[PDB]
Design a protein around this ligand. Structure first.
Ligand SMILES: *[C@@H]1O[C@H](CO)[C@@H](O[C@@H]2O[C@H](CO)[C@@H](O)[C@H](O)[C@H]2NC(C)=O)[C@H](O)[C@H]1NC(C)=O
Ligand SMILES: *[C@@H]1O[C@H](CO)[C@@H](O[C@@H]2O[C@H](CO)[C@@H](O)[C@H](O)[C@H]2NC(C)=O)[C@H](O)[C@H]1NC(C)=O
Ligand SMILES: *[C@@H]1O[C@H](CO)[C@@H](O[C@@H]2O[C@H](CO)[C@@H](O)[C@H](O)[C@H]2NC(C)=O)[C@H](O)[C@H]1NC(C)=O
Ligand SMILES: C[C@@H](N/C(=N/c1cccc2ncccc12)NC#N)c1ccccc1
Ligand SMILES: C[C@@H](N/C(=N/c1cccc2ncccc12)NC#N)c1ccccc1
Ligand SMILES: C[C@@H](N/C(=N/c1cccc2ncccc12)NC#N)c1ccccc1
Ligand SMILES: *[C@@H]1O[C@H](CO)[C@@H](O)[C@H](O)[C@H]1NC(C)=O
Ligand SMILES: *[C@@H]1O[C@H](CO)[C@@H](O)[C@H](O)[C@H]1NC(C)=O
Ligand SMILES: *[C@@H]1O[C@H](CO)[C@@H](O)[C@H](O)[C@H]1NC(C)=O
Ligand SMILES: *[C@@H]1O[C@H](CO)[C@@H](O)[C@H](O)[C@H]1NC(C)=O
Ligand SMILES: *[C@@H]1O[C@H](CO)[C@@H](O)[C@H](O)[C@H]1NC(C)=O
Ligand SMILES: *[C@@H]1O[C@H](CO)[C@@H](O)[C@H](O)[C@H]1NC(C)=O
Lengths: 320, 320, 320
């Protein structure tokens, strides 16, 4: 009585855990196309002077093709133009202010300084003095990102994701998009869960984080694609499950370099002088993470499960 | 009789499926060097005027170092020079043609338009009128890629692939290239299946897709490296198997952004005006996919297989 | 007697190999921030003339953001300025020297040549003659990298690594850095093995390879992050293990393209002529490899182990 029930329960553990099947890791390749533009009219303070930042930003202006299953979209920026190699006083900071030449030692390097000191204490503005350095001059300001993200419209951008997956051992290949589907759609958790077209603001709403806040100083968001794939015939299902998870740590600590931002350089020549424009770029990197398991009935696996089950059979008969 | 045969068959399932061994996922790192150049003499129509595109393209002109186990080779391009921020009529399309100002609404954005409308209907050429937009002017043409790919010689290029793999649990490391091998070789399915030097046209012949067709509008090809690795001593083999699979979907639908292409921007300054050159790049991205399993005799695994087998022993004795 | 001992030993194989638990592959995302600068005063020979290379190199000058779980740091460079499309004699090499026009065939391409020949034998310097080619002129020298790496200070640079990992099946996420930790630290094998801050020279000392030697011609180093993660409650541990392994092959053979180096192009316009500056970049690419296994008690797994163990029970009783 109880033994045929132990057998039916163990068989349930077979069918549910799909141990008659063999599991094979998935192979994924990703291709994304970003669509959308943003118009930028804003007022940014450079060196204590108000300035008007106005420009139209298209695809080539705020992104470049994905590498390593991840793409980036710039949302804010601080542009420092005209840097040329030379000597200049470092930007005023608690570390950089100097009372006299004794505070500056030639050759000193600081993790928060972009230049090597010359050992002299010189004026920056009025009577405030900082330590003179040798680097790209003038030094970029120690200034916060614009309070509204210059590319605030970034949440309205649209990312199109095409994912190809293969299982070599089972020799089975399929793609994220099935042929003949109505591509004109915006992904929704319930209305269009197979629609590959994503809107960034929708993504940030799913994970619960406000897009604008992350867009001011950048972040790392993650798009997850699950593939529970069954290859039997008696039952079949091998389609993706889109989830969204915010990857960045959200420390908000000046020591841990919070948000996502980097220093992009644009070199040129002017008046027979080598010059550089340093752009501090703030944006959200999207990591596309694909993980899948493919099961297909293996005779050896089913026989091994049977082998672990008939021992519980005999021993179960001994236990009663 | 039949029972010793069931034992020999189960032992065959052991030796064949290598269950006395433990399986460990592979760790891969890739390094590719692309060699080859292409001379380009062609005739391309810009704004209804015939032009001569002539130039020599070396490594730095059509590729950049691999990131994320994938490298790209440009094969075709459409170059739009002199773009500067301003107001211009959008390029004539079924969506962009306007009969009067009522058709243009200020601030409108279109997925196929690269600019924000100003709300005015202005002439583009002759009496044909399109909606005026605010963006990088003039707008790139809506034009097909050159009928012969400008970099048609791309199939003759040579990619050299060096792959390092490690198994941490077994502490075993090996590389794609064994020391002392004759590197001067071109990979062939039978003549040189271990030769790492690949020719792109050969790759496209293996997968059966014509190189030129894909090169006109770009594509995503995939190089697969298999590692069936055995670590025992009684038998040993741990070398790669090169296969080739075309990753792109080949939709050929204007709604799904077919082929592989992106918008690359080159910013400069001219006559004290901020200017931009937009190059639409068409090329084949090669994804190097490495997947391997490393087996090495584990006593616990063999004992567990024995444990599943002796139950089939006793129960098998009961079945007769 | 011996049978209860076989049971205690098999139970030891259970607890040690953690087969009551289920193993799940790890999901990793990486974010690195490189800090440090380098001052460069050196003397490099261009075209047989001594020159002084002097410049200050910050983050934007020697690196760009990581893609595909790997970042690059330039350590040496050879800069060829002023290239424009045209005809020039190829640089003197055993392959390129020509006695007369019969040695040059028009349209010939060489794996070590950057241009297509025109079929004429012309002088390069004095009476030495090479084959005239059509390419970016003049051709970059066939010259060794500077004997001291121009960016020798690269070993003093600091890489900060933040790693996020997730197990979907168990729904458990954790990050490389625990909240509240003293970030100001330099990683040491024993003193600070959890400290994420790495120094490149320390990395190269751990693997035993001198930083400078690799920095002259570039290399591929690999940072490994292990995650042995236990999710039970009766015992718990899920933290990373940092190891370092040198990925490049160290062939030192001119045929196999040794070290890590690539050709980076900077296009500009001068005197109404399209021009290019070709920089041969030498540096160390760091591949961040994250691999982890997450175990959590699965009832079906423990029951399957029991099923393989009770058969060894009965059969063991038969063996005595
Ligand atoms: C994203 O786009 C939507 C709609 O295109 C913007 O919302 C509209 O904003 C305009 C003015 O900017 C208003 O006149 C409309 O009434 C708004 N409609 C809705 C439904 O909100 C939205 O502001 C855009 N997002 C960002 C960040 O700019
Ligand atoms: C790839 O290279 C081969 C040989 O270098 C090219 O084939 C030759 O083309 C030339 C003229 O271009 C002919 O004179 C030869 O007779 C051809 N030989 C062979 C064996 O085909 C081939 O055209 C190149 N591929 C591309 C796309 O340019
Ligand atoms: C890395 O930095 C260290 C210390 O900042 C350098 O070592 C010092 O070098 C200076 C001169 O360059 C000497 O005056 C000091 O006595 C040295 N101190 C120590 C502890 O070595 C080191 O040279 C730098 N590495 C490179 C490659 O430049
Ligand atoms: C290619 C580059 N985009 C750039 N876009 C701008 C175009 C006009 C004005 C700008 N002003 C400030 C900042 C940017 C821009 N400029 C450069 N270089 C880029 C894109 C994405 C991520 C990093 C870098
Ligand atoms: C670095 C860049 N290559 C570029 N190569 C050209 C060199 C001369 C003329 C060209 N004309 C049209 C198009 C290209 C070129 N030009 C730029 N910028 C590149 C390479 C590979 C993939 C994307 C981009
Ligand atoms: C962005 C670029 N860095 C560049 N840094 C230099 C700055 C001043 C003088 C230089 N001279 C020689 C060589 C380099 C430089 N120059 C360019 N382009 C780069 C960075 C990292 C890896 C590849 C390329
Ligand atoms: C995979 O299956 C298809 C289906 O017919 C077959 O054409 C192909 O050759 C198979 N691949 C391999 C490597 O056997
Ligand atoms: C796609 O679906 C939308 C409904 O959201 C519909 O309006 C549209 O016509 C559909 N497209 C096609 C080609 O059927
Ligand atoms: C791996 O094996 C080699 C072979 O001797 C040994 O030198 C090395 O220390 C081993 N690695 C570890 C981490 O034990
Ligand atoms: C490599 O093999 C080729 C045969 O295809 C041969 O001509 C060449 O000499 C070999 N190289 C060496 C170094 O033996
Ligand atoms: C994962 O566990 C947390 C812990 O409460 C829970 O809030 C979350 O919803 C879980 N995720 C899923 C997908 O169930
Ligand atoms: C971090 O540790 C160092 C010791 O190496 C110590 O000097 C420093 O004060 C610590 N930082 C904090 C915030 O406690």
């Amino acid at each position: 009585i109880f033994h045929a029930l132990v057998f039916s329960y163990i068989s349930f553990a077979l069918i549910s855990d799909k141990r008659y099947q063999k599991k094979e890791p998935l192979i994924s390749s990703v291709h994304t196309k970003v669509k959308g533009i943003a118009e930028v009219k804003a007022e940014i303070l450079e060196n204590g002077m108000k300035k008007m930042v106005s420009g139209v930003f298209d695809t080539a202006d705020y992104t470049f093709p994905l590498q390593g299953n991840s793409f980036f979209v710039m949302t804010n920026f601080i542009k420092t133009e005209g840097q040329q190699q030379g000597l200049c006083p470092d930007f005023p900071t608690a570390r950089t202010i100097c009372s006299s030449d004794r505070g500056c030692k030639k050759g000193r390097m600081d993790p928060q300084s972009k230049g090597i000191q010359t050992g002299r204490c010189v004026v920056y503005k009025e009577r405030l003095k900082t330590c003179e350095v040798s680097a790209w001059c003038p030094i970029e300001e120690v200034k916060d990102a614009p309070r509204p993200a210059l590319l605030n419209s970034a949440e309205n951008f649209t990312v199109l994701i095409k994912n190809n997956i293969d299982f070599p051992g089972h020799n089975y290949t399929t793609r994220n998009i099935l042929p003949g589907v109505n591509i004109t759609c915006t992904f929704h958790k319930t209305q269009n869960p197979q629609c590959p077209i994503f809107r960034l603001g929708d993504i940030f709403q799913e994970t619960g984080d406000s897009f604008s806040d992350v867009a001011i100083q950048g972040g790392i968001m993650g798009i997850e694609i699950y593939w529970d794939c069954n290859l039997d015939g008696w039952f079949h299902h091998c389609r993706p499950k889109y989830s969204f998870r915010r990857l960045d740590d959200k420390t908000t600590s000046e020591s841990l370099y919070p948000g996502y931002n980097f220093r992009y350089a644009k070199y040129y020549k002017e008046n027979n002088v080598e010059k550089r424009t340093l752009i501090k770029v703030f944006g959200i990197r999207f990591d596309i993470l694909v993980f899948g398991t493919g099961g297909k009935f293996n005779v050896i696996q089913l026989a091994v499960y049977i082998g672990s089950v008939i021992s519980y059979f005999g021993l179960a008969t001994v236990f009663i």
